[PDB]
């Protein structure tokens, strides 16, 4: 996995991979790695599929369960803590996940959670997770500002996955990506690496490693 | 030390069509360099029209089967003969497997049939309860074998259009019952040549509105 | 986690803790705060396995957060350092223990006397001049044995602990990328924030 | 693999498989398990398929130089001797499990190697992972006074079984025939039982499918 | 376990336990609240017959449970510890989970929930 | 820790009418990193053709070795190396490293100058020699290589046609491995002329 | 977990036209010692069912227990218990699978492999197989042990599909089942000579064969063999 | 295996079973370990198969080095070579080895040579897997100065037993006599053995 | 150990190499050079096992200084390349193998173009446009994807450089004690004093 989510200016982008593995083995290019939790909340996945994908899905009954009780949207806080609270139940257990909460709330403004496994829980502003997040953020790094518009904080998201689905060989497939507004979260297309490498290649001239 | 897993071979694999889905997979059941059965099958029509295959370790894959069937069961019980559809199968198909997330079932799983707009669908499963839909699944002994044979024929993955430069790709299209089964029939008598665990028949079930349809082929048994 | 220090001068005690998250090969947090209050003259500081430290520390203030609720009371320092080690002591012999070192730093209203308390994974609890866990000790002990005084005022023991930190910056293997520094004293507790 | 070696009247018979295994992968469909150590003392070998090549091919020209030096047909003693001292100094870490049959000026001759180096003697003998079923068929239709054709026929049923019954064992068999005071006949795949079916589909792709980079003409003269 | 249903209904539909209960209430000192525009206020009646007091140590009407929502009770004494300590708990756990305060509506809401579980539980009144 | 996996590639070799083919990809890479998309697994001496999988630095290295014994052979014997003798060759100095071997995947291809006949042959670490009349493969995704050529394999397919087939064969089969990929160089071979093409494959 | 300690060889069986045939020998060895003579492995179960049991002889005689009691439990408040509410081979199977699943699932198995043989009420042929791990298959020829890897491949020379059951007599049947028997005693080192047979007919019903001894075997080219 | 040498009036007589075994599988269920080492010299192996027919061998090798240069040699000096063999190569050896021999001089000798390379001469000699289970029954029943007959008999009912209670041994029994006749191969089949 | 970079450019290639010694918990050294000039116009930097690393890279520039005075000319970068890589070759086959990474950056003076190749301890040798060895590759590498080009001058490229440098500054664990940068081009060897 390649997941990275990065707060700026204009709100939060998330994006993703789309590549499954066992061993060597690619077993899926097709793999949806965030998970809707609602209109104003987004989780990515990584690490183990079913630990992930189960208990995440499992986060989003939790949440519904606090707003029909509280009569009142989860805080991004609280939905993360359920998750970390829950992993730390079983830690030592086995579980593998690396997980990021990211939403909008009024009380708490664009929020992104880090969730892991072995319990930890930290706010922040910029979190690359996976296999290949060493490479989404020497990319995402080096050309991050706070200023950047809706359309270059897409491409730069989009860019980095790229950047790790390129080099991280457990990295790959497609490019999901995600914008989270004060409205809510807006879905921005699946994007192949098939076609998208030749593409950025081609018009922003980088790759110059690769056989053209 | 006793080892509760082991491993029974075989293949399967699930292709879906515009108004259909086909579950198919071979009849051998092994256990190290023997043959048990040259005809044991292994996908079963679940009811209302869900057919489902559990590969890999036998023992746990007939749990799993008898398990879901039981499902299948309680939730007309529980829910007025309602008719369990296929994403919602596959959700408690999810639970079932990570319910043994610690002493996991030893199997892949591959459901097919129709969604609730009467087109094709194929969901297959790991392990311990990751799912997808798919038009497209290999699963067991073999799957590495058949699975890219299958990108490339069923998908048109790495096909262009011929004269176009390799700008337009080859256009994604439904594929007939006809042709589907083509495709099942030669995957299977490939991996039949070069895996040993593959052989001796294949049972394929067809999946329309109509119902579940059944048809069987002879496959080398050496 | 990794670097956590703890200076008592003659008013005060002043506890620096370092910034840096790390998991793999990536710094994945630069700005880190690794420390609670327990009360508004008690604070204490953390470092260990990942998950432990802030489940343990959030669950001790709470605890301690519940009692002043309570008796309308601010534990003692010297009271809320037995509390902790009891909890480490129990935690020792269960079956998956806490793997935390604390600091707790508070100010003594009743005393007039700042406390510095060291105590490690095991409940082993030790009042100090001066502390730190891990391997910042082996660095930080031998150096202030020779700077330190007890009469030193607050503004003395800043420099004393800037001291440390260049040490640590200039011999560490690791980044850990700076440290937040606080202060606990008879006005209660507040952050340096130029450091 | 499977392979034996059966005697009759006027000499001796071995056969084999033509299975080569990856793991549970079908390498070659049709491989030679059938050595030449001199013109009529032939080789059957089981177990690291380059260290029967090899060991055989060692010892076949050893043999060669040792009859030109003697002025005489080489025996199959000489061969099986030379074969298990070598196998032996090795401690079982050549995995050569042979068959050894041949005629010579002494008479018609049947000997097994294991890999650590111990020899037998016998009038049937089967090796390799299909070793068992092929000595269930050779125990109980073997008699004393096999003529040419029965021991043909009883040779290549033990392979047959272990063809349909081992999963380590394929395809075709291949037979050698030494009989005293003629030439030794090698019948190269003497029955072919598992000829591939007919493929329901031709994948010729249309001229232009593969989308390309660059060509070039690739100097191969001087 | 002592396991007896004592709040149980009567024939006219009526909880007898529950209601005399509320009996226990009108007997106990007089409490009262009112909210202003930017405020709320409660005040307590404390009863006369007990000269020689020390009103340093008794136990006060009016107790926090956390630093901004306040319970004051009418009724048994002894009693009202018992929901006390049980709101403090929560106050805090809700801190710990939610990382936030608790509402008065939410505090109050928890309250009520255990004074009703303990009218149709067994072996308690 | 598994020297023929650390690197990743994949070689395939088929046959066709009066010619034969051999693809690579172009990966070597550190476990998950890739470090360049350059490394050609082919080689050639005169008309015989030499594919190698495995541990980057035995590929290297018997690539020498084998120029080496190639170029002395020519000297001695007057004339090229064919196929079949070359492939003993090669299985001869294996073996040589019986209890130290080199952790590759060899794959002969070529045409017979002599007698025309098209010639393939594939061997395991230690010398084995696996000769076929349709296909040989080798590397990290052999498996799916296994089933993609013995699907769209046919006989007797013209120059032409051939190269459509093993590179539909190795692309495929490629993005189905994660250690392999990243390029791919086909070669087709006639009697006399052999045609060398660079495929247009997925960069991930 | 467990490690067997006295266990028992082979079982093989085979189905034919009117019925099923099933054998194994009466041996109970300990490690290499060949220590009990008279143990038998085919228990009846009513008079249309046999099950054979290979492997531990301590888990084969709680099985036979259980098997016993199930008969016991079956004839309870049942007045067909004799005719059409009796035991089917199928109930006995379905029975002994969950179990053994159940004590792998436990990690405290069963340490067997069991062959259930029977006809059905409405004639059918039953044949199926359950071992240690609760994997079972069914097949025309069953085998456990060494009899899977030298009884089968002669078994599977006479019934090879389904469509050579129906072609295949008692008579053929049986002499294929005492002919694996013998090739078992000359290759399998913890068999031995004298075995039990089974046949379970839908005419004739069961017929329940003790003391059997392998017979008209090979030994005489061994004085011809000299040396290595 | 089980195998057996024992000496009686005449000279000496060697037996054994004829099973070899990889686990519980019989490779050879004729095998004949009953070994020429010299004309009237002869051994039992047990343990390895390989080991034991390479030792052997080599011993056969230096019998007949010896006879060219220094004639007939004794079963002493037979057993002292696969001794120096068996001893000073101990570490990578699992042979269980009975040495047996006719002079004139000398008459019918025995040597048993077990795991360790040690020499015991003995009146008679058991060994094999198979040997444990009839000490009790060889001990109680062996008596010196036999008959050809009686010892037959003798060897011929031992390894009966041996055969019937352990697993690694059993199909026919071969036995050698060593006498100044010369030398005679006997064999036993089970139908007549088995019924003992 | 641990870091050692290089870019090729138009005209040059340019290799940087971090400076830390570090040896349990200590920082013994922050200056240290961890390269060897091989000819005038070829720089080996080198990165690995302790002890190994020095003797390793000493013995390759003895053996080619040798080659330099016996046949009085230089050798090309791709034939050094060639004779470390064998050297190597030979040694993971050896009963104690050097563990040592090396970059070898070049002017081939008869081509007039810079040549830059990576060869890791096993002897694994490719040419590149830009190389790393260790944990530097995972951050480097996508870096250098995106914004490097084949025309950049020697300017241009250390620009890119310290891009790389702030990356590993900002994500590495470990502080490394900055780079030596060391150009190689038409006129020689010569170091970057002000990094
Ligand atoms: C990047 C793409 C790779 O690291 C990401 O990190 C993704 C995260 C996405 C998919 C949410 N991670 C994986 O792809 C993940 C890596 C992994 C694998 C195994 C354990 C932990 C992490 N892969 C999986 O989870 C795969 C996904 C399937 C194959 C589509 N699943 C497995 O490997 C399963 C279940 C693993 C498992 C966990 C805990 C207990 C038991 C099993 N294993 C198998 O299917 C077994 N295998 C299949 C191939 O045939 C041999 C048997
Ligand atoms: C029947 C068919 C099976 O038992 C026969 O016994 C045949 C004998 C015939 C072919 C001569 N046996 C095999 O086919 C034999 C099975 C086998 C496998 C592994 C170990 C021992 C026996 N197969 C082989 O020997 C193949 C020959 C190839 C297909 C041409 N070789 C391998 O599988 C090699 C084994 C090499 C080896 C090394 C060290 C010790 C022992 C054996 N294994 C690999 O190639 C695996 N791996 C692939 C990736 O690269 C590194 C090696
Ligand atoms: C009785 C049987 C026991 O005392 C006799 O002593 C005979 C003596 C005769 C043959 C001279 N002994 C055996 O038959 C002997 C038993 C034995 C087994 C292992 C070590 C020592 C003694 N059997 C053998 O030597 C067989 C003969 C082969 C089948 C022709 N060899 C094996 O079983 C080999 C031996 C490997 C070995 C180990 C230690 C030293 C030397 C050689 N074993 C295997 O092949 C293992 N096999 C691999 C495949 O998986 C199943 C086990
Ligand atoms: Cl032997
Ligand atoms: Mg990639
Ligand atoms: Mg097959
Ligand atoms: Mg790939
Ligand atoms: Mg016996």
Redesign the pocket.
């Known amino acids: 996995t390649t997941t990275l989510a990065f707060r700026f200016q204009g709100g939060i982008i998330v994006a993703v991979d789309s590549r499954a593995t066992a061993g060597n083995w690619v077993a899926s290019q097709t793999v949806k790695k965030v998970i809707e939790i609602n209109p104003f909340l987004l989780g990515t996945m990584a690490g183990g599929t079913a630990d992930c994908q189960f208990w995440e899905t499992w986060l989003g009954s939790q949440c519904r369960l606090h707003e029909l009780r509280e009569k009142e949207r989860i805080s991004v806080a609280a939905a993360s803590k359920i998750l970390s609270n829950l992993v730390y139940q079983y830690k030592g257990a086995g579980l593998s996940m690396g997980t990021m909460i990211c939403g909008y709330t009024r009380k708490e403004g664009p929020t992104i959670y880090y969730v892991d496994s072995d319990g930890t829980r930290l706010k922040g502003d910029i979190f690359c997770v996976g296999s290949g997040q060493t490479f989404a953020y020497g990319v995402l790094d080096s050309n991050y500002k706070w200023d950047l518009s809706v359309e270059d904080a897409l491409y730069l998201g989009k860019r980095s996955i790229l950047a790790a689905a390129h080099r991280d060989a457990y990295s790959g497939g497609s490019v999901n990506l995600y914008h989270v507004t004060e409205d809510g979260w807006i879905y921005h297309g699946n994007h192949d690496v098939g076609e998208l490498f030749w593409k950025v290649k081609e018009e922003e001239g980088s790759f110059n490693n690769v056989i053209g | 030390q006793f080892n509760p897993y082991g491993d029974n071979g075989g293949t399967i694999l699930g292709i879906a069509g515009e108004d259909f889905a086909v579950l198919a997979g071979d009849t051998r059941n092994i256990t190290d360099y023997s043959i048990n059965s040259r005809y044991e099958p292994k996908v079963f029509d679940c009811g209302d029209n869900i057919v489902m295959s559990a590969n890999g370790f036998a023992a746990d894959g007939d749990a799993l089967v008898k398990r879901f069937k039981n499902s299948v069961k309680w939730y007309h019980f529980d829910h007025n003969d309602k008719k369990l559809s296929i994403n919602s199968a596959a959700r408690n198909i999810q639970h079932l497997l990570y319910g043994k997330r610690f002493f996991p079932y030893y199997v892949h799983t591959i459901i097919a049939g129709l969604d609730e707009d009467g087109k094709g669908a194929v969901y297959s499963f790991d392990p311990v309860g990751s799912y997808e839909r798919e038009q497209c699944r290999a699963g067991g002994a073999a799957a590495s074998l058949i699975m890219p044979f299958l990108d490339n024929q069923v998908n048109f993955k790495n096909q262009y259009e011929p004269g176009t430069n390799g700008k337009v790709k080859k256009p994604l299209k439904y594929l007939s019952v006809e042709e589907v089964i083509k495709l099942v029939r030669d995957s299977f008598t490939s991996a039949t040549e070069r895996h040993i665990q593959v052989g001796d028949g294949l049972e394929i079930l067809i999946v329309t509105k109509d119902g579940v349809r059944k048809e069987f082929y002879e496959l080398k048994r050496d | 986690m990794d670097i956590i220090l703890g200076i008592r001068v003659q008013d005060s005690v002043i506890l620096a803790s370092s910034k840096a998250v790390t998991r793999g090969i990536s710094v994945l947090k630069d700005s880190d705060d690794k420390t609670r209050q327990l009360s508004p003259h008690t604070l204490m500081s953390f470092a260990g396995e990942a998950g432990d430290t802030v489940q343990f520390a959030e669950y001790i203030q709470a605890n301690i957060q519940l009692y002043s609720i309570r008796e309308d009371y601010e534990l003692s320092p010297q009271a809320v350092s037995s509390f902790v080690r009891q909890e480490l002591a129990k935690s020792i012999r269960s079956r998956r223990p806490y793997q935390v070192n604390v600091l707790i730093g508070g100010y003594d209203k009743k005393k007039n006397k700042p406390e510095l308390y060291q105590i490690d994974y095991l409940g082993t609890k030790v009042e100090l001049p001066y502390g730190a866990h891990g391997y910042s000790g082996f660095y930080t002990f031998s150096l202030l044995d020779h700077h330190y005084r007890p009469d030193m005022t607050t503004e003395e023991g800043l420099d004393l602990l800037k001291l440390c930190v260049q040490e640590l910056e200039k011999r560490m293997p690791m980044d850990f990328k700076g440290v937040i520094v606080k202060i606990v004293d008879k006005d209660g507790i507040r952050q340096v924030d130029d450091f | 693999?499977?392979i034996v070696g059966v005697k009759f009247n006027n000499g001796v018979v071995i056969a084999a498989?033509t299975?080569?295994?990856?793991?549970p992968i079908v390498?070659?469909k049709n491989?030679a398990?059938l050595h030449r150590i001199s013109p009529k003392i032939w080789c059957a070998?089981?177990?690291?398929?380059?260290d029967?090549?090899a060991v055989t091919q060692l010892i076949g020209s050893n043999i060669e130089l040792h009859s030109l030096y003697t002025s005489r047909e080489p025996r199959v003693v000489s061969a099986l001797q030379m074969l298990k001292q070598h196998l032996f100094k090795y401690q079982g870490h050549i995995?050569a499990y042979l068959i050894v049959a041949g005629v010579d000026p002494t008479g018609s001759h049947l000997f097994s190697i294991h890999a650590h180096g111990s020899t037998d003697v016998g009038y049937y003998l089967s090796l390799?992972?299909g070793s068992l079923a092929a000595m269930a068929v050779l125990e109980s239709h073997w008699k004393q006074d096999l003529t040419k054709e029965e021991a043909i026929k009883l040779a290549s049923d033990a392979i047959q079984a272990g063809i349909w019954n081992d999963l380590?064992?394929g395809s075709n068999v291949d037979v050698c025939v030494m009989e005293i005071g003629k030439d030794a006949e090698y019948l190269r795949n003497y029955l072919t039982p598992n000829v591939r079916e007919e493929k329901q589909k031709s994948y010729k792709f249309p001229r232009g499918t593969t989308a390309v980079l660059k060509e070039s003409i690739v100097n191969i003269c001087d | 376990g002592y396991d007896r249903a004592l709040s149980i209904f009567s024939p006219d539909g009526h909880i007898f336990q529950v209601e005399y209960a509320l009996e226990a209430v009108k007997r106990g000192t007089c409490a009262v609240g009112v909210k202003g525009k930017n405020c709320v206020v409660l005040g307590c009646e404390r009863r006369s017959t007990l000269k020689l007091q020390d009103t340093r140590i008794t136990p006060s009407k009016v107790s926090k449970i956390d630093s901004h929502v306040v319970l004051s009770f009418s009724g048994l004494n002894a009693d009202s510890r018992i929901l006390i300590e049980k709101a403090r708990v929560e106050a805090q756990s809700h801190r710990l989970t939610l990382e936030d305060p608790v509402t008065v509506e939410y505090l109050t809401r928890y309250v009520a929930g255990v004074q009703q579980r303990y009218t149709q539980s067994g072996g308690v009144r | 820790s598994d020297p023929?996996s650390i690197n990743g590639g994949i070689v395939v070799a088929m046959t066709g009418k009066d010619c034969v083919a051999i693809a690579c990809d172009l990966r070597l890479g550190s476990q998950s990193l890739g470090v360049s998309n350059k490394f050609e697994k082919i080689f050639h001496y005169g008309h015989v053709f030499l594919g190698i999988t495995?541990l980057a630095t035995d590929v290297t290295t018997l690539n020498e070795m084998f120029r080496y014994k190639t170029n002395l052979y020519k000297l001695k014997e007057e004339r090229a190396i064919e196929p079949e003798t070359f492939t003993q060759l090669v299985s001869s100095s294996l073996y040589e490293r019986r209890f130290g071997?080199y952790?590759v995947?060899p794959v002969v291809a070529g045409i017979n100058s002599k007698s025309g006949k098209p010639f393939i042959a594939?061997?395991?670490?230690?010398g084995?020699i696996?000769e076929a009349k349709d296909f040989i493969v080798s590397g990290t995704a052999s498996d799916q290589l296994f089933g993609m050529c013995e699907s769209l394999y046919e006989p007797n397919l013209e120059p032409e046609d051939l190269f459509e087939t093993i590179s539909q064969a190795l692309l495929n089969a490629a993005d189905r491995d994660a250690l392999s990929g990243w390029g791919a160089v086909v070669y087709i071979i006639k009697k006399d002329e052999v045609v060398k093409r660079y495929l247009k494959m997925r960069q991930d | 977990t467990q490690q067997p300690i006295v266990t028992g060889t082979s079982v093989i069986s085979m189905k034919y036209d009117n019925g099923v045939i099933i054998a194994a020998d009466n041996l109970g060895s300990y490690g290499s010692l060949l220590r009990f003579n008279g143990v038998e492995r085919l228990i009846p179960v009513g008079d249309n069912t046999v099950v054979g049991i290979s492997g531990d002889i301590s888990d084969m005689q709680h099985i036979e227990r259980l098997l016993k009691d199930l008969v016991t439990e079956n004839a309870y408040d049942n007045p067909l218990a004799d005719a059409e509410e009796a035991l089917e081979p199928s109930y006995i199977f379905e029975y002994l699978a969950t179990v053994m699943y159940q004590r792998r699932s436990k990690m405290n198995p069963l340490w067997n492999a069991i062959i259930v043989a029977g006809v059905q009420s409405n004639g059918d042929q039953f044949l199926r197989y359950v071992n240690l791990l609760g994997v079972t298959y069914s097949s025309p020829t069953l085998a456990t042990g060494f009899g899977a890897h030298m009884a089968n491949p002669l078994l599977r020379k006479v019934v090879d599909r389904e469509s050579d059951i129906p072609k295949t007599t008692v008579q053929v049947a049986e002499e294929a089942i005492v002919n694996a028997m013998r090739v078992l005693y000359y290759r399998d080192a913890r068999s031995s000579r004298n075995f039990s047979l089974a046949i379970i007919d839908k005419n004739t019903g069961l017929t329940f064969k003790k003391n059997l001894q392998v017979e008209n075997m090979k030994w005489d080219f061994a004085k011809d063999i000299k040396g290595y | 295996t089980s195998i057996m040498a024992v000496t009686f009036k005449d000279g000496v007589i060697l037996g054994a079973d004829s099973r070899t075994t990889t686990g519980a599988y019989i490779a050879n269920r004729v095998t004949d370990k009953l070994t020429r080492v010299h004309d009237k010299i002869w051994c039992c192996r047990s343990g390895s198969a390989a080991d034991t027919q390479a030792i052997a061998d080599i011993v056969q090798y230096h019998l007949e080095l010896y006879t060219s240069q220094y004639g007939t040699p004794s079963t002493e000096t037979a057993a002292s070579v696969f001794k120096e063999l068996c001893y000073e190569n101990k570490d990578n050896l699992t042979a269980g080895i009975i040495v047996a021999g006719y002079d004139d001089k000398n008459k019918g000798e025995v040597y048993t040579i077990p795991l360790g390379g040690s020499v015991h001469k003995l009146p008679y000699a058991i060994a094999g897997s198979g040997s444990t289970f009839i000490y009790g029954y060889c001990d109680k029943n062996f008596r010196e100065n036999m008959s050809k007959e009686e010892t037959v008999d003798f060897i011929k009912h031992s390894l009966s037993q041996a055969i019937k209670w352990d697993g690694s041994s059993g199909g026919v029994i071969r036995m050698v006599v060593l006498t100044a006749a010369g030398v005679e191969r006997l064999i036993f089949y089970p139908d007549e053995y088995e019924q003992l």
Do not use: V
């Open positions: 693999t499977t498989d299975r080569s295994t990856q793991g390498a070659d491989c398990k070998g089981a177990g690291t398929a380059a029967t090549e995995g390799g992972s380590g064992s | 023929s495995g071997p952790f995947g594939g061997f395991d670490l230690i084995c696996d």
